[PDB]
Amino acid sequence: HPSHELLKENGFTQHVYHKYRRRCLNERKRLGIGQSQEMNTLFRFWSFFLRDHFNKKMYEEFKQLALEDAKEGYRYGLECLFRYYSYGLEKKFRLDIFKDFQEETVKDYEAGQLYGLEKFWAFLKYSKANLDIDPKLQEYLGKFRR
Amino acid sequence: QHPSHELLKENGFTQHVYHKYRRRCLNERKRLGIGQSQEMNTLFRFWSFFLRDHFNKKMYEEFKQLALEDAKEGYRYGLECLFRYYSYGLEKKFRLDIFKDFQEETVKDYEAGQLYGLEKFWAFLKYSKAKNLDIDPKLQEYLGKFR
């Protein structure tokens, strides 16, 4: 499966990927949001690949599509994105993505979900790291733990 | 202070304290609407933890009913708590009837287009020492494509 060849050490080619991505996005369109298991492989691919091989362009598309699916009630993409945030920022902290992590966690919370908040809390527990947390987010974390 | 904490202590559970806490959470759900109640979310989490070592059939059935009602409206916390109760709880103390429920809810979750339940079922199979598991034929198909 291209999903896996591409994650092997130096096994990524921008040719295999383009074909694979094009194919997944087409099944999503053909079958409907949340209906393509192949699209789900791409969400998983992005979640893992971006941790070691950050590509701003891939990342932006990852987030945009995860959120579109989530708006219609299909969580897997967004669940994959929160795992990217939590596990990736642990290994290689970076400030912009951490800011995005906070913003998407707040949005997830205000939409009545807790998946994102638990991932954020878990990140802080395992984080080695001077963190400045959004006031709203500290507030939400406090309530969650009661 | 919050009843959730007290009820989970060793020997901390009483019917009276639980009844008032449950009533309160359900009242907030009825007032704010499905998935709009943070108190209800603490109750889902309580159930998920408490039922592992203090299984109660009537409590479990209400947990499952409310989790599925909420998930229908798109609010998934209750069901996520239920799947964690299934995945972790059955590894610790296997119950055949609950395992059959776990299979049923996983198949439903997958056919509704989610993978949270399937991943938790997968994780249970990876860690369980139970032998001779009879797993739903369609669920085996789904597990196959998944991992």
Author numbering:
A (entry chain D): 797 to 925, 927 to 943
B (entry chain A): 796 to 942
Publication text:
La-related protein 1 (LARP1) belongs to the ubiquitous family of La-related proteins, which controls the metabolism of many RNAs in the cell. LARP1 also includes a highly conserved LARP1-specific region in its C-terminus that contains at least one DM15 box (also referred to as a unit, motif, module or repeat). We have shown that the LARP1-specific DM15 region, a sequence that is highly conserved among LARP1 proteins, but does not appear anywhere else in the proteome, specifically binds the oligopyrimidine-rich sequence present in the 5′TOP of RPS6, but not the 5′TOPs of PABPC1 or RPL13A. The structure of the DM15 region from human LARP1 suggests that its unique amino acid sequence has evolved into three HEAT-like helix-turn-helix folds for RNA binding.
To understand the mechanism of its RNA binding activity, we determined the crystal structure of DM15 from human LARP1 to 1.86 Å resolution, using the same construct we used in the binding studies. The crystal structure contains four copies of DM15 in the asymmetric unit in two pseudo-dimers; ∼98% of the amino acids are ordered and visible in the experimental map. Superposition of all four copies based on Cα positions yields a range of root-mean-square deviation (RMSD) among six pair-wise permutations of 0.29–0.95 Å, with the majority of the differences appearing within the C-terminus of the construct. Our crystal structure reveals three structural repeats that correspond to three DM15 modules, which we have found to exist in nearly all LARP1 protein sequences. The structure of the DM15 region reveals a positively charged patch containing conserved residues. While it is uncertain that LARP1 exists in the cell as a dimer, the crystallization of the DM15 region as a pseudo-symmetric dimer revealed a positively charged cleft comprised of the concave surfaces of two monomers, which allowed us to hone in on the probable RNA-binding amino acids. We reasoned that the co-crystallized sulfate ion mimics the interactions of the phosphate backbone of a single-stranded RNA binding with an electrostatically positive surface. Therefore, the position of the co-crystallized sulfate ion, in addition to the pattern of highly conserved hydrogen bonding donors and acceptors lining the patch, were used to position a short polypyrimidine sequence on the concave surface of the monomer. A putative TOS-like sequence appears within the vertebrate LARP1a primary structure in amino acids 928–931, which are contained within the loop connecting α7 and α8 in the crystallized DM15 construct. Interestingly, the putative TOS sequences within the non-crystallographic dimer of the human DM15 crystal structure presented here are approximately 50 Å apart.
